Write a protein that binds this ligand. Structure first.
Ligand code: ZN
Ligand code: ZN
Lengths: 1132, 174
């Protein structure tokens, strides 16, 4: 029935957890970071973080603790998945090969049991005698640690307290004891219990203390020295050691809640505290050396340190360095200084780590303008709020820029016969040549005895016999090095000027109109081996020596003027070996011979921005598999260079492109630069492994980014972005936003910091009177509609909404016969006393210019969660209703029809006269607008209940849905159109567990397509709470089946990190049902195929009947699958 | 334990920021009162009151007649589409979970108990809930501010002369 594909375009960036210890080696400080499904391992050092190994798991990491059982050389790792997959991991490294082996594993799920609020707690005993798991209320799961229990057997000790807040094991306890915080009728208390592995019960423990603060939320076991625990709350931080009891109440807390903490000293003394607003604190414990015997805890104080990103995770490394793991904003590496500098902060950020999550909304846009998408998102929240621009391409780091206009070419050069680095850069101009010398980082004019400067150079560089060559329009000059001077020169027999110039280390082929001359480079002499007259004006030349040959090309690639041809010629005799008649109007600009992986090709570029590429046989010289792409519009110049190992071609033009090979398939990658007229590799000591680039006015040296990667441009907002549109005509984006302002005695509400809405250029406030018939300390939400510039992204205009009015939906569009393009917002009057809005409105603005204009207004009796432009009309959902409004000539929106069969219509998507509705709990429904009738008709709905979160239309018959339990699904309109009941239903044909919470779906692609053919159809990108960006397409039953087989084979061979089965992981799953995936294939699995050994590769293919298209079956080879998957990787 | 839920939009909002749903929690929606106590905000209430006229509301389960009212059906086990009104479905759950079957909610514009004339001129929303395993049914209707709130569930008439006939919540009821 259904055939979909799902690949990760961007791995989750939000940090869910981060622990620290000695995992890689007992004498190494490791930093383990949990994204969601990703596990990153580092080594802490001087520079700080050294990436060691990164892996994935088939599940969401919920618990992650390092620990050390007696008898282990280094630490072991504990991990519990959200689907309850448990395991103990060991870091084992033999050679350049690293593996994370499994010492034990099992699924600790219970058949019944209520998942506790405050979720899964996973703690480990200090003695390493056992693991404690609070998975369900009233139950505490225990797992013994005998090197015997590898299947992770466990028992459930009952717990009276049915509502635990937090739990930790205590230190210095002959018997493992649990100290937690709970809440019953009497309030919140904190008791203890001992855990006996023997009897398998829980007795009664050391101490008890009823009624701690009502907001007591964290527990902390203080180490050996002090023993006992600490309890963090709202203004209440207390110590409890049986008989001891301390209690401070720093007003510094009061403001925000302390959510995370970390022990700085192995003994207690210092701890880090994390505020919910980003405040970093320090908790100190004053140790009192009695005089003789033992040591008590005299006192404890709190000290503000500074501001960081809103922290989720907090880990102290060493030498005053701390890693701040964020979920709402970028994560960071911070240094704690002894002295609080200006303003008063010991906190100074070192490194900032991009985080796109949460992604609340997004839109695809061709900003730069030319067939390449780009994602603009509403990421983060609160103070960490922001916009992100995500683009594909290769990046270059500019290292110098000189104002040299008119550069007509440039070549790298070795001035010192002995040194192997470049130290000179030759520049060409209309009629001269200028030689720049390279001193470290300094570049300055210089002369080179043998070279002429009053002529244009067509080529120059190092050649055979410690010689140097310079070919100008006037002649080709051979220059000595150590002796240094002109030691030979060639010129056409009649002084005619050289028109085209090709040249490698030992040979030269220049053209004088139609005349071709083959010369060879020998000591102190240039030898003219031959010559010929081409049937037409020569346009371009290449004699690049390919193959294991030795600097002597047997072939000569030439491009002609008249018949717009590219032809191969045997070098000695200029004998024709192949004449490829191409293009038609424009002549070839550039032509080059090169090798990409193992194969040789011929590239030829027209003045069209058009590029032809053939397979080349360097023996026979015949061109094969003629292909064509469009790299732009200006003529294109081809040049070769070697990034790291391999070698690629740099294509200079208005659309700069790096051409290379992946798995035998060429790759055209766009460079993130404006326009490049000429390029050349430059490898000096000052500019190691670099590129010398040149446009129409400036020289520029920098270095290429190895290979392509999404680049993330970010725009701070300092407040929460909620929705976003794009208005072409206005050249800008419309963004819904909210900020936190607290009530103030001075009549209204102030704020907490400057933000995009406040520090705006223009500004305005709602003047509406439609409605008008907290304490002080309470927080209040204020919404705004920002108008950000497409190019500068500065906030042009900001607009405030009525007090208490939340803006929930946005949309840029035209309506009726109205010529103008408005910005339309849907809202809701939110009062805490109501369970759901009863009032709201649809405001219609316009940014005709300079400022925003409030054109119209329309009252509504509920929240306008979603709205979409619909065939000139405006579709919108209010609460339980779906309404279609018309736009008169009198500029008013007026109801035509409605649909009321919903609990709460949150999401809306349109295609034609069909409409897709996403409801709180009645999953998707399909409506159709009946024109003649003037209202709506229910076509079909999904009869399975589903708490939606996002929705999308893959095509007329298939609808994609994201649900609140991290699952994706597809519903289809039954094909058995033989009954009005069968059409009424839409079968769930696709089920897949994503393990990601989805907020937005939107047709689009971050990949080019103007490049002159896809195994997939469609392209829906999607945003995630973890900052993860995915893609979804459609396959033919053919490909699906192959890939489904592929998966099952691969699963037999891929070593799964925690011994978790891929099929378990991808099984649709909720607190209700659990089913096997179907209709879905994850390309993450399929793409991991290209990363295993041929042996394993050959095993995966073993005994597989494969159809290479020949319709004639054959035994499948690894290369068949390589070709298949390589094609698949190109959809993103 | 009983906690007051959170206005939908507050839930809508924060869920796009934090993947956590927040469902699993013994909450009662804001503005609703647990009209059951024979002899948060629950409120103790008299079983009945023959003092004021008014036809009783038939048991929900019995799936009988009550026309000016809205019917809600909720299946705790999933497998069947829920139907009715947001609040109907919300209370149905909170109702099954706690042993409660009567609920009241008086709109914003309204100043213990003594409802009658002083508090008349509007409508007060009632809720009746039935069990039957995993299957939970609810009948919801509108009552005059005039009216008395009791454990018994009837459709009282009006004592005040100001109390209205249809509200904007009383429509589409059948
Ligand atoms: Zn009345
Ligand atoms: Zn009513």
């Amino acid at each position: 029935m259904s055939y979909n594909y799902v690949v990760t375009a961007q791995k989750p960036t939000a940090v869910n957890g981060c622990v620290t210890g000695h995992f890689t080696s007992a004498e190494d400080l490791n930093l383990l970071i949990a994204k969601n499904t990703r596990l990153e391992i580092y080594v802490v050092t001087a520079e700080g973080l050294r990436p060691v190994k990164e892996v994935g798991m088939y599940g969401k990491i919920a618990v992650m603790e390092l620990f050390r059982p007696k008898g282990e050389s280094k630490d072991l790792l504990f991990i519990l998945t959200a689907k309850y997959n448990a395991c103990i991991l060991e870091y084992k490294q033999s050679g350049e090969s690293i593996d994370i082996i499994t010492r034990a594993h099992g699924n600790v799920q219970d058949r019944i049991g209520r998942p506790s609020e405050t979720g899964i707690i996973g703690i480990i005993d200090p003695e390493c005698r056992m693991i404690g798991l609070r998975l369900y209320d009233g139950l505490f799961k225990v797992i013994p640690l005998d090197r015997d229990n590898k299947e992770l057997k466990a028992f459930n000790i009952r717990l009276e307290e049915l509502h635990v807040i937090d739990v930790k094991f205590l230190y210095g306890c002959q018997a493992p004891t649990i100290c937690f915080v709970y809440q019953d009728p009497q309030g919140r208390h904190v008791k203890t219990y001992e855990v006996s592995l023997r009897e398998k019960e829980f007795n009664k423990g050391p101490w008890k203390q009823e009624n701690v603060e009502a907001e007591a939320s964290m527990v902390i076991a203080v180490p050996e020295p002090f023993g006992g625990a600490i309890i963090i709350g709202q203004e209440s931080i207390t110590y409890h050691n049986g008989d001891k009891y301390l209690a401070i109440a720093p007003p510094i807390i009061k403001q925000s809640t302390i959510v995370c903490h970390n022990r700085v000293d192995p003994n207690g003394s210092r701890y880090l505290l994390g505020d919910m607003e980003g405040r970093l604190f320090m908790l100190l414990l004053e140790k009192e050396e009695q005089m003789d015997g033992t040591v008590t805890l005299k006192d404890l104080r709190v000290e503000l340190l500074g501001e960081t990103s809103i922290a989720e995770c907090l880990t102290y490394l060493d030498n005053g360095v701390v890693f701040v793991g964020s979920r709402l904003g970028d994560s960071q590496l911070v240094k704690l200084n002894v002295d609080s500098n200006e303003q008063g902060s010991y906190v100074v950020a070192m490194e900032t780590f991009t985080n796109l999550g949460p992604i609340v909304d997004m839109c695809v846009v061709d900003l730069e303008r030319q067939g390449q998408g780009q994602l603009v998102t509403c990421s983060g929240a609160f103070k960490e709020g922001s916009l992100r621009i995500i683009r594909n391409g290769i990046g270059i780091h500019e290292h110098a820029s000189i104002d040299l206009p008119g550069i007509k070419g440039l070549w790298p050069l070795r001035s010192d016969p002995n040194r192997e680095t470049y130290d000179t850069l030759v520049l060409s101009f209309v009629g001269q040549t200028r030689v720049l010398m390279l001193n470290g980082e300094e570049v300055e004019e210089t002369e080179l005895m043998g070279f002429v400067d009053d002529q244009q150079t067509f080529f120059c560089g190092n050649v055979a016999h410690q010689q140097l060559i310079q070919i100008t329009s006037a002649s080709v000059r051979l220059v000595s090095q150590e002796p240094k001077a002109l030691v030979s020169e060639w010129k056409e027999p009649q002084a005619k000027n050289i028109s085209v110039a090709s040249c490698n280390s030992s040979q030269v082929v220049v053209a004088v109109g139609r005349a071709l001359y083959y010369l060879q480079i020998h000591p102190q002499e240039l030898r003219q081996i031959s010559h010929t007259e081409m049937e037409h004006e020569v346009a371009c030349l290449d004699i690049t020596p390919l193959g294991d040959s030795n600097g002597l090309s047997p072939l000569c690639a030439i491009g002609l003027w008249t018949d717009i041809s590219a032809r191969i010629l045997k070098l000695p005799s200029f004998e024709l070996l192949h004449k490829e008649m191409l293009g038609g109007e424009i002549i070839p600009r550039s032509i080059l011979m090169t090798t990409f992986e193992s194969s040789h090709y011929l590239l030829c570029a027209l003045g069209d921005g058009a590029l032809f590429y053939f397979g080349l046989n360097i023996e026979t010289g015949l061109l094969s598999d003629r292909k064509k792409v469009t790299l732009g519009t200006q003529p294109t110049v081809l040049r070769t260079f070697r990034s790291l190992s391999t070698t690629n071609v740099f294509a200079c033009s208005d659309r700069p492109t790096v051409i290379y090979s992946s798995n035998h398939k060429l790759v055209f990658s766009n460079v993130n630069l404006k326009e490049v007229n000429y390029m050349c590799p430059l490898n000096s000591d000052g500019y190691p492994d670099s590129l010398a680039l040149a446009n129409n006015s400036t020289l520029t040296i920098g270095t290429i980014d190895e290979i392509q990667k999404l680049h993330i441009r970010t725009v701070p907002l300092y407040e929460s972005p909620r929705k976003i549109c794009y208005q072409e005509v206005s050249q800008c984006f419309g963004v819904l936003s909210s900020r936190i302002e607290v009530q103030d005695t001075s009549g209204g509400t102030t704020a907490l910091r400057p933000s995009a809405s406040t520090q705006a250029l223009s500004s305005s406030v709602s003047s509406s009177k439609l409605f008008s018939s907290t304490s002080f300390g309470e927080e209040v939400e204020v919404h705004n509609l920002l108008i950000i510039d497409q190019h500068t992204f500065e906030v042009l205009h900001a607009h405030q909404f009525l007090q208490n009015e939340y803006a929930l939906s946005l949309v840029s569009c035209k309506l009726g016969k109205d010529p103008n393009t408005y910005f339309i917002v849907g809202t809701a009057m939110v009062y805490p006393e109501e369970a759901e809005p009863k009032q709201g409105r649809i405001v219609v603005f316009q940014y005709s210019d300079g400022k925003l204009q409030t054109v119209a207004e329309k009252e509504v009796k509920g929240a306008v969660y979603s709205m979409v432009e619909f065939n000139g009309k405006l579709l919108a959902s209010i609460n339980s209703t779906v309404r279609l409004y018309e736009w008169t000539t009198e500029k008013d929106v007026r109801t035509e029809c409605n649909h009321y069969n919903n609990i709460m219509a949150l999401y809306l998507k349109t295609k034609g006269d069909f409409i897709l509705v996403g409801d709180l709990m009645r999953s998707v429904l399909l409506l159709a607008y009946k024109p003649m009738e003037g209202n709506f008709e229910e076509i079909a709905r999904d009869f399975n209940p589903n708490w939606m979160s996002a929705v999308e239309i893959l095509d007329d018959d298939n609808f994609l849905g994201a649900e609140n339990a991290f699952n994706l699904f597809v519903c289809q309109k039954d094909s058995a159109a033989t009954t009005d009941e069968e059409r009424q239903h839409l079968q769930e044909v696709g089920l897949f567990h994503l393990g990601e919470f989805v907020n937005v779906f939107c047709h689009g692609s971050l990949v080019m397509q103007n490049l002159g053919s896809t195994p997939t159809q469609g392209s829906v990108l999607f945003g995630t709470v973890n900052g993860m960006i995915g893609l979804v397409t459609s396959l033919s039953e053919s490909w699906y089946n192959l890939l489904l087989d592929m998966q099952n084979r691969l699963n037999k061979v891929i070593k799964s990190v925690g011994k978790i089965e891929h099929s378990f992981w991808r099984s649709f799953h909720t607190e209700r049902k659990t089913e096997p995936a179907t209709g879905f294939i994850d390309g993450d699995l399929i793409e991991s195929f290209l990363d295993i050994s041929r042996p394993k590769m050959q095993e995966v293919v073993a005994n597989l009947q494969y159809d290479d298209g020949s319709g004639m079956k054959r035994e499948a080879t690894a290369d068949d699958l390589i070709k298949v998957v390589e094609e698949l990787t190109r959809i993103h | 334990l009983i906690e007051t839920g959170l206005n939908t939009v507050e839930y809508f909002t924060s869920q796009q920021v934090t993947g956590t749903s927040s469902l699993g929690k013994n909450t009662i929606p804001p503005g609703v009162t647990g009209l059951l106590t024979n002899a948060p905000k629950i409120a103790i209430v008299p079983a009945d009151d023959k003092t004021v006229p008014g036809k009783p509301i038939p048991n929900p389960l019995l799936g009988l007649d009550s026309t000016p009212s809205t019917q809600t059906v909720l299946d705790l086990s999933g497998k069947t589409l829920p139907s009715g009104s947001y609040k109907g479905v919300k209370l149905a759950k909170f109702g099954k979970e706690n042993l409660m079957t009567r609920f009241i909610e008086e709109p914003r514009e309204n100043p213990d108990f003594k409802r009658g004339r002083d508090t008349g001129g509007f409508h007060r929303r009632e809720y009746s809930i039935g069990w039957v395993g995993d299957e939970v049914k609810v009948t919801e209707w509108c009552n005059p501010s005039c009216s008395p709130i009791t454990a018994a569930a009837r459709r009282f008439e009006c004592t005040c002369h100001q109390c209205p006939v249809t509200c904007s919540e009383c429509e589409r009821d059948t």
